[PDB]
Amino acid sequence: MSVYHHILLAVDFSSEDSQVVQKVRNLASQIGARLSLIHVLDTAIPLDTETTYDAMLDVEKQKLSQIGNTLGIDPAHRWLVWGEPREEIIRIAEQENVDLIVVGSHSTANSVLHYAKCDVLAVRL
Amino acid sequence: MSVYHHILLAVDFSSEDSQVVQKVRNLASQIGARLSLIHVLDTAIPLDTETTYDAMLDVEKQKLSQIGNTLGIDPAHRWLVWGEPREEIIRIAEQENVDLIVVGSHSTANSVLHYAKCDVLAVRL
Ligand SMILES: [Cl-]
Ligand SMILES: [Cl-]
Ligand SMILES: [Cl-]
Ligand SMILES: [Cl-]
């Protein structure tokens, strides 16, 4: 039986994403685990200018989707959430029955690591 | 090909070792990696009493060997070293061409993680 069943990858959209993506794909396939994906984004509204929240979200959505598409993850298992990375990472992991969180170091990594209720894989970038 | 080739397990000889041992055995076997093992021990000599350095080392050696024997690791790949855990863990990993260090949390974990030149798997105990 599989040593981990459900691996959550956290990506930050750096140029080094691709190393981690292929590694995590090889990982999950060799051990038989399913993958989910999350990226954490990353008060006065300016009145003299057009806001670009939706366009900015679309860029993020595309980057998430580049990665999601490579990994064959259903959009239902791709997460783009507002908030503090550590907290949001850990809340999705709990909610979604993850048993391995994967993060890159380069922080967020060290905070997820100190508060996660499951194993954490920190991948050197 | 194997996502990791050489996994170094670090054990501290707590009652929770066995969970980590079987997990790491299942891990390495599913991905095709070889295992090494390390435990880091863990100025005036008393003149009125017998010292027990050798007996104390034998106890540690037995505990290392319980774990090593389970995992089928040659004694050549089992390490019982004097020193600061973080430093010694990282020095063996470098020396021995490790590409995944495994540690339990419960520290040492967070220090190995902040200075390791390879991926680190932190296993919740
Ligand atoms: Cl993130
Ligand atoms: Cl805006
Ligand atoms: Cl140790
Ligand atoms: Cl002594």
DSSP A18-69: HHHHHHHHHHHHHHT-EEEEEEEE--PPPSSS---HHHHHHHHHHHHHHHHH
Instruction: Tell me which chain A residues have a C-beta less than 8 angstroms from the C-beta of B30.
Output: 2-3, 30-32
The residue among A91, A67, A88, A90 whose CA lies nearest residue A78 is A67
Kindly report the CATH number that applies to the domain delimited by A2-43+53-125.
Answer: 3.40.50.620
Instruction: Tell me which chain A residues have a C-beta less than 8 angstroms from the C-beta of B2.
Output: 30
CB of B33 within 8 Å of any CB in chain A?
no
- List, as ranges, residues 94-123 from A with C-beta within 8 Å of B: 105, 109-110, 113-114, 116-123
List of long-range contacts for A40-48, beta carbons under 8 Å, 24+ apart: A40/A10, A40/A81, A40/A82, A40/A83, A40/A84, A40/A85, A40/A88, A40/A89, A40/A108, A41/A80, A41/A81, A41/A82, A41/A83, A42/A12, A42/A13
* DSSP H helix total and E strand total for chain B: 4, 5
- With H, G, I as helix, E, B as strand and everything else as coil, classify residue B24: helix
List of long-range contacts for A90-95, beta carbons under 8 Å, 24+ apart: A90/A115, A90/A116, A90/A117, A92/A8, A92/A36, A92/A38, A93/A8, A93/A117, A93/A118
- In what side-by-side order are the strands of the sheet with A119-124? A78-82, A34-41, A6-10, A100-105, A119-124, B119-124, B100-105, B6-10, B34-41, B78-82
Q: Report the separation in Å between the CA atom of B64 and the middle of ligand 4, taken as the mean of its atom positions.
A: 20
Resolution (A): 2.2
Domain locations in chain B? 2-43+53-125
CB of B81 within 8 Å of any CB in chain A?
no
> B122 and A120 in contact by Cβ < 8 A?
yes
Q: Out of B30, B110, B120, name the one closest to residue A31 (CB).
A: B30
**Phi–psi pair at B30, nearest 5 degrees:** -70, -30
Instruction: Tell me which chain B residues have a C-beta less than 8 angstroms from the C-beta of A114.
Output: 110
Compute the nearest-CA separation of B35 from chain A (Å): 16
Largest CA distance in chain B: 59
**Residues A109, A115, A118, A119, CA torsion sign:** positive
The residue among A101, A120, A114 whose CA lies nearest residue A38 is A101
List of long-range contacts for B64-67, beta carbons under 8 Å, 24+ apart: B64/B11, B64/B37, B64/B39, B67/B9, B67/B11, B67/B17, B67/B21, B67/B37
DSSP for residue B16:
T
